[PDB]
Amino acid sequence: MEPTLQSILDQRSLRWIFVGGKGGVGKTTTSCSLAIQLAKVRRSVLLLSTDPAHNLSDAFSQKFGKEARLVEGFDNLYAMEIDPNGSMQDLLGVMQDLAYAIPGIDEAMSFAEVLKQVNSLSYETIVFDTAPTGHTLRFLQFPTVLEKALAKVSQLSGQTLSDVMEKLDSLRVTISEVNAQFKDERLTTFVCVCIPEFLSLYETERMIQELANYGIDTHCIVVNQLLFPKPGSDCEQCTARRRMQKKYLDQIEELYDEEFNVVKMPLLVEEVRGKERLEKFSEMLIKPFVPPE
Amino acid sequence: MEPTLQSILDQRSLRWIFVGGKGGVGKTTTSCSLAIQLAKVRRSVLLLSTDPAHNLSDAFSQKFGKEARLVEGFDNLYAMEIDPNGSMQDLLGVMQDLAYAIPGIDEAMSFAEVLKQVNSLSYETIVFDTAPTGHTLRFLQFPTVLEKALAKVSQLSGQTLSDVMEKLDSLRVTISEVNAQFKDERLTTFVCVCIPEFLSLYETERMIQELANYGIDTHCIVVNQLLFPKPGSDCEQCTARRRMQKKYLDQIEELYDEEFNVVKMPLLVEEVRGKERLEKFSEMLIKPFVPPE
Amino acid sequence: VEQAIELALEFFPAGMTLWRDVMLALFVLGAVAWWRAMSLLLVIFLLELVVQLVNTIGAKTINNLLWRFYLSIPGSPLAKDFAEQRAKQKEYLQVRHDLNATSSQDEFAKWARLQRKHDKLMDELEKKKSQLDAHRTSFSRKLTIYRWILTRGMQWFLCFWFSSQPMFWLPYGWFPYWVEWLVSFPNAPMGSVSIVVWQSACSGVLALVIEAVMAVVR
Amino acid sequence: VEQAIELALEFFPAGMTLWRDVMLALFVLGAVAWWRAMSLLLVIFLLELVVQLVNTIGAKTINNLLWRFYLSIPGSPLAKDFAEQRAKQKEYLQVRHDLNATSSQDEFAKWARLQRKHDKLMDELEKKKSQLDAHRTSFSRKLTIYRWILTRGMQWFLCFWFSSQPMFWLPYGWFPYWVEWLVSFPNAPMGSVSIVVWQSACSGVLALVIEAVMAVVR
Ligand SMILES: [Zn+2]
């Protein structure tokens, strides 16, 4: 297929973008490259991170906190790396016993109020990045968890309880509309990343069929660190490493060449930071570099 | 701790050795290196493989089948790469409906009759290699599966059924004695392998706490492809690759330096085959190579 | 409700044989009274084999007869889908053999296509198990009562109808008035017998013959 | 047994108001008969509030009273372990905050030590839930019958004892003989009343006052 992300630019009715996978892949570099190349043709784009690695500070050498702002060099870069434990600081005895009754409560309510603040403004599009997957995909379960929790709190009742009852009802209707906005597929998309070895491909296919069991498609898949040989210069270990990399590369060619896209992105010698260097790294997601192979 | 496998040589009352992990690590090279260095001080050692990759043929360029034999260059190398589907060929209509009633039947009975043939001879020690783990660890569940299946077959009964009833009882008592020999820990040991990246370490720790939930310890852990710099010569990609490899290496140093062993094994330029080359590869499991680091 | 967990917590604090012998003697005189002496005795004769099958009941094995009852009719929809179930199961095990025979290295695309067909059919497998086992246990629960009506309707009709109509007359003067009291309650004329001991205690008559079969096979 | 799945498969094939008004009139004459005229009427008076609590029963909320009953005694072993349970739960949530706050990159050893303590306490958590919820539902099942004995023992003792002893005498000539029949069965002298309508239908006397409270709050 087309080895670029031109189809994400072309729709323009998209609103929500999910991008993930597993660690050891540098998803933050992919995220910032997506956002910057998105900003060339967009109006109001917001980045959101929840990984405990405070990596956007490393991305721009500028401290961020619990409020959005514009960072230098851009008129549209807004982001706020947040913590879920601040809501637990909001919990700091009966509500903690409720957290014993259901092992997950506060993270969904925090994500809820976050998304209310998200829909407070009039931003054009947003993007995401997440933790390992077993800790991610629970957000499709947050509406049900919220319902069960509210029912249980009411079960114990059988300070004012009606205030938290109405608050949880507002969280219920809000999360139902947002998950309902998820399956629309005209504003919600999903891209996953991986790297040429076994296990990365393994959990990648597990993720794909996972989203297949929820009725959300995809069409674009990015890989990373695809080493291509330098003309003339050679490392002898790098030769066999290229050989094995081609071996899995052609296997992914045997799978996804029908209805998905493959993004070739080579590793550079440095961890690419700085604005202009990230621009050059982001440029390749439109113009695919191709040596004679 | 001691960076070798000297403690496995020193006990001599050991009988069973389990070695595993995940793909992409070359466990067969580790297995043959273990067996050959084991044969220097042993009497009757048997290798057993069940992975559908018929890799011992690649290990010695000699076709093997469903019977043990001695291979050239050795007086003690015996192995037979077997298939579980031959027992399904033994099944080739009611027994297949029984396989519908329980999704796993024939693999445990095949492994059972295999182990009866194992205890037919008077061999000193044996070794193993397995598929991915979710397909492995069911062997600790085979005794229970066998019991449930036999009970169910009898439930339907409520050709001769008593013959298969007595056959399954013999399989029951045999598998109960073998699993009972497992937790003895004076003849059953376990070593796992991994490589310096994230996910390999991840599922490695998952395996360790898995065996912790069955009451089987370990003390020895091997890694692979640990690239050490050549004096004078350098590849610039290899420098940063060494840097990241050290980063995870020191993290494993922060975990296992208390009561486990670390085996440093470097990658060579070729897939090490042939007897004498495998001897040189196997030598390092006793004498650990150490550059100045 | 169970009267057993209540008994599990109760630990926390601190004529009939001679009755069966006289029913044996009245069954002896009832068996002697037929040779020197009609249709109602054959009605009790069939109810004896009904109570026998009640004894030698296989409450599943009756439905094991119902299995070949519905392994018989070719116009049955469910046995048709039962055959389609086994056909899909055969294709299931076929691809599973081709799966476990394959390698996860060099047919990884073929690996995934097999894996996808595997969990494709794995979900539709137990849908039929939910369908047919529901139909089977509901059909059993219907026919248990369907037989039970034919059993106990004859266990109470005999006492409803043909009660005043005397079945047979007791010899004059053998039993005291208080014993004769039993006859007075079902409307049968004094000096004749009703139809009760043939309902319940006649089950003992064949019961020893049941243990005779216990000596036959064992 | 349920008579509901049997009704779920039954779909496959194809005076009391005037009775309560006369019990109202006899309760009017029983209430008038006390002013111009003892202890047994107060016994019925307490059984009326017992039947009232039977009506305004919270079968859980009685055990909600039992909760503060056992939130009271300091020598209780179980409420002691209940406090130890909440203490372990507090340390549980504390390490869970320190877990989710940590990073999986640069404290991977600290990561594992936290994870190990996490699933360390996670298993002992529901062991107490298995212990105490078992004790609580068994204690409820004890005291349900423990109250039920004090209820129905007085619901049948009144009819056992003080039956021949007449409670009060009916006016001579008001009721036909067949109505008077009721008195003859409990051994009370003819012309006096027994103690039945005070047991069952006196529950209706306060029942309208129950709906009076239904107008009070609502
Ligand atoms: Zn190199």
Residue numbers in the entry:
A (entry chain A), B (entry chain B): 14 to 105, 120 to 185, 205 to 339
C (entry chain C), D (entry chain D): 300 to 313, 335 to 357, 1001 to 1181
From the article:
The eukaryotic guided entry of tail-anchored proteins (GET) pathway mediates the biogenesis of tail-anchored (TA) membrane proteins at the endoplasmic reticulum. In the cytosol, the Get3 chaperone captures the TA protein substrate and delivers it to the Get1/Get2 membrane protein complex (GET insertase), which then inserts the substrate via a membrane-embedded hydrophilic groove. Within the membrane targeting stages of the GET pathway, the homodimeric ATPase Get3 (also called TRC40 in metazoans) adopts closed and open conformations in response to nucleotide load and interactions with other pathway components, allowing binding and release of the TA protein respectively. However, the cryo-EM structures and native mass spectrometry of hsGet1/Get2 and scGet1/Get2 show they form a 2:2 heterotetramer, which is stabilised by Get3 and interfacial lipid binding and is important for efficient TA protein insertion.
We subsequently obtained single-particle cryo-EM reconstructions of both amphipol- and nanodisc-reconstituted ctGet2ΔN-Get1/Get3 at an overall resolution of 5.0 Å and 4.6 Å respectively. In both reconstructions, there is clear density in the membrane region for two three-helix bundles at a local resolution of 6.5 Å. Weak density also shows that helix α3’ is present in the same conformation relative to ctGet2 TMD3 in both the amphipol and nanodisc reconstruction. Furthermore, the density map for the nanodisc-reconstituted sample provides evidence that ctGet2 TMD1 and TMD2 occupy the same position in the heterodimer as the equivalent hsGet2 TMDs, albeit they are poorly resolved and likely exhibit flexibility on the edge of the complex. Interestingly, the conserved fold of the ctGet1/Get2 heterodimer adopts a different position in the membrane compared to the structure of hsGet1/Get2, with each heterodimer half exhibiting a 40° rotation with respect to the membrane plane. This is largely due to ctGet1 TMD1/TMD2 not adopting the parallel arrangement observed for hsGet1, instead being tilted by 40° relative to each other. As a result of the rearrangement of ctGet1/Get2, the hydrophilic groove of ctGet1/Get2 is tilted so that it is open towards the cytosolic leaflet of the membrane, in contrast to the hsGet1/Get2 hydrophilic groove opening to the cytosol. In addition, ctGet2 TMD3 no longer completely traverses the ER membrane, which is notable given the high number of charged residues found at the N-terminal portion of this helix and the adjoining cytoplasmic loop. Indeed, we observe significant thinning of the nanodisc in the vicinity of ctGet2 TMD3. As this helix encloses one side of the hydrophilic groove, such membrane distortion would likely lower the energetic barrier for substrate insertion.
